[PDB]
Write a protein that binds this ligand. Sequence first.
Ligand code: SF4
Ligand code: SF4
Ligand code: SF4
Ligand code: SF4
Lengths: 183, 184
Amino acid sequence: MIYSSDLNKNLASQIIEAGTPIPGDDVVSSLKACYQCGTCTGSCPSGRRTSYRTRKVIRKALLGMDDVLDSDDIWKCTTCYTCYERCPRDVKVTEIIKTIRNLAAQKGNMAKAHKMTAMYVLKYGHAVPANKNTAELRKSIGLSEKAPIAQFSEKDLNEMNTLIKELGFDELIGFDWEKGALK
Amino acid sequence: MIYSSDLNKNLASQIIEAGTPIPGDDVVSSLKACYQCGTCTGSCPSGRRTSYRTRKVIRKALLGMDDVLDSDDIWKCTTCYTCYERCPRDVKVTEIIKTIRNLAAQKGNMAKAHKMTAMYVLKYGHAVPANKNTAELRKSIGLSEKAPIAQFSEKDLNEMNTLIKELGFDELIGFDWEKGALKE
Ligand code: SF4
Ligand code: SF4
Ligand code: SF4
Ligand code: SF4
């Protein structure tokens, strides 16, 4: 039983506004053109091994089911862009899902491993930072012990911290600058 | 993931055959006219409190999903005939569900209480047979101690046993005549 009181009439608009200006109004507003044909669900490789149905995400969005933001289903999309490529209504499906995830993240629906990966780029400027074995491995091959990346360049590392703070990404992931850990 | 190997192409025909000649070919074949509009599900009173969706039963039947016969969902239908009354495609929905249940029963998907009720009509000719308190109650009101029913008339009781045997209802419910009890 789904009553009006359970639905959010602005959910669709909220997704569009979250998608403006990145990736853009015209891109995200494409969800409004979906005619629930199911080409996205049949194309989905994740749907072949889970309860995830790409078409229902768009449906829930258009109907106003906020629970979609709390669903684990949206995080099962690998972003292979196969649905995006085949949709006959030009729905920027993959892009819409990412934007939906942006709203989910703002609601506090983020995995720890994900927040950890985000923290390593904030702290060491990289998703997979170099370890003690990296230095030995790079040397043994015939490459610079330390690669010319932002990890070993404070200037670049600080530039990211400035941008992050301004963007509010630190607040989003719930990062405490003094402790250097998440909340 | 639903593959062809999991489906039974003849399921729909099997339901129609089970419904012939009772309630009839034309009655049960009406499932073939369902266009999945959902008027039956919206009308269903059971569907408001359960996962039961009247429209999906018809869908599974047309698609070939045998699991529908093993589902508890079909047994949640109260036979209120509300879907039957509103379907715009003249689908004899209530009648189809009963026939579907007939096939479920043949597969051995019957509740014990149901099998027990069926046994009481086989043994005592009635769903709710008279007990020691009935005789006292009927007397105290001003009615015949024993009602004029098949329960206290062997002739009528034996007639039912003859029909049952011929119908194979005893075999269906898995009733052993010598022990007077059910099997499994
Ligand atoms: S494909 Fe585009 S149109 Fe068909 S459903 Fe998936 S989203 Fe709506
Ligand atoms: S993109 Fe996300 S949704 Fe579209 S197909 Fe690859 S996984 Fe399924
Ligand atoms: S109503 Fe008659 S037609 Fe519409 S769904 Fe239920 S059955 Fe199929
Ligand atoms: S008949 Fe069985 S199904 Fe059709 S409505 Fe009444 S209960 Fe729901």
